[PDB]
Amino acid sequence: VPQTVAWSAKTGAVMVLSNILCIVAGRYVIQVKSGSFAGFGLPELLASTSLGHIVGSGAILGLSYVGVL
């Protein structure tokens, strides 16, 4: 079974990074909507952080799998 670890600040770090990464990506790649202060609303923010919890969950599970944690 792929090893997973109990929540630590390291798990938080990956999640925070991934959420911010997607918030910046969402400002760039969301085609229909002051780098983050133009046209930024809740559906844009709620979508980029939804992909952050998808990317972050995948990254956390993968880094636990290989040993990086």
């Binding site: 609303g41 809740l42 559906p43 923010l45």
Partner: protein, 129 residues
């Protein structure tokens, strides 16, 4: 319009009905008012024959919470008719007092419950110790 401190930082009001938001907030206010006052009330005095979070499951086995659920469920059905008919179409101080004390009750109840997780105790019981 009541209790407007210009505080909608995330701008939820832009993407959900203000009537729906106000109804949900005032319902949350009144539920948390009852819950917080009840949480302090249990430690002040006890009804005959009858602590914060595990007492939910101490009460469900009797059928108390199930009965309360049935009556809240009934009232909430007529109240869902109420909110649908709201949505499909010297006192202002008192409304603002209700909403302010209700937001305070939400903070207070959250505090008491997470205090229970910390210490396994009710609010004023911990306050005393």
């Amino acid at each position: 319009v009541p209790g407007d401190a210009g505080f909608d930082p995330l701008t939820i009001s832009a993407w959900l009905d203000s009537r729906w938001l106000r109804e949900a907030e005032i319902k949350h206010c009144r539920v948390a008012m009852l819950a917080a006052a009840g949480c302090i009330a249990q430690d002040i005095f006890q009804f005959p024959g009858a602590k914060m979070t595990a007492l939910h499951d101490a009460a469900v086995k009797a059928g108390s919470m199930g009965q309360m659920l049935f009556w809240i469920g009934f009232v909430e059905a007529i109240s869902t008719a109420a909110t649908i008919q709201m949505l499909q179409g010297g006192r202002a101080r008192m409304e603002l007092s209700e909403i302010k004390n209700g937001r305070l009750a939400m903070i207070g109840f959250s505090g008491m419950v997470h205090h229970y997780f910390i210490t396994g105790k009710g609010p004023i019981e911990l306050l005393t110790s």
